[PDB]
Amino acid sequence: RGSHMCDAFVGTWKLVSSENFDDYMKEVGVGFATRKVAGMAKPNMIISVNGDVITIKSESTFKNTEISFILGQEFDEVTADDRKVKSTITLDGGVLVHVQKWDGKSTTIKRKREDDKLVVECVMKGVTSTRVYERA
Ligand SMILES: COc1ccc(S(=O)(=O)Nc2cc(C(=O)O)ccc2F)c2ccccc12
Numbered sequence: 756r757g758s759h760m761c762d763a764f765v766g767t768w769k770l771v772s773s774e775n776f777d778d779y780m781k782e783v784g785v786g787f788a789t790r791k792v793a794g795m796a797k798p799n800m801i802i803s804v805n806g807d808v809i810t811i812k813s814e815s816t817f818k819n820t821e822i823s824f825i826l827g828q829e830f831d832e833v834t835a836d837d838r839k840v841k842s843t844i845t846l847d848g849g850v851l852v853h854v855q856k857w858d859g860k861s862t863t864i865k866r867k868r869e870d871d872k873l874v875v876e877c878v879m880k881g882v883t884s885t886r887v888y889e890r891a
Pocket residue numbers: 780783785793794796798813817834835836864875876877886
């Protein structure tokens with residue numbers, strides 16, 4: 756197989772900034788103790804592409820997680836904060852758009868490349884958070 760545009764995401768990334776994530780987590784419904792421990796974490800994110808399958812791994816002192824998915828195809832995800840969600844990830848103009856659905860709720864996480872960074876923007880009921888990763 757040849758190159759794909761989404762190979763721009765591939766690599767090893769480290770969190771360098773996080774803005775408003777506590778208020779986002781409150782809107783998502785994350786409990787106090789999990790918010791405090793999860794907000795401290797400075798994860799590494801490892802993204803790989805193999806054929807049609809994209810794999811996103813996160814490693815941190817809080818939790819290790821791994822999702823593998825095909826664009827546009829719904830999957831089951833257990834999130835780092837222990838929600839059991841239905842997830843669908845698509846590519847819209849270079850941006851990975853990830854919708855998580857659970858318990859009648861929904862949140863959207865966008866991942867995009869900007870300069871040498873990977874920018875993660877999430878939104879829940881009007882509350883947004885921005886988390887920025889750099890190459891590790
Ligand atoms: C480290 O505590 C977490 C790790 C991951 C998730 S999430 O469900 O994967 N969504 C997500 C991930 C990122 C990221 O990886 O930076 C940025 C914004 C997000 F909404 C969490 C979701 C809720 C609370 C804590 C989470």
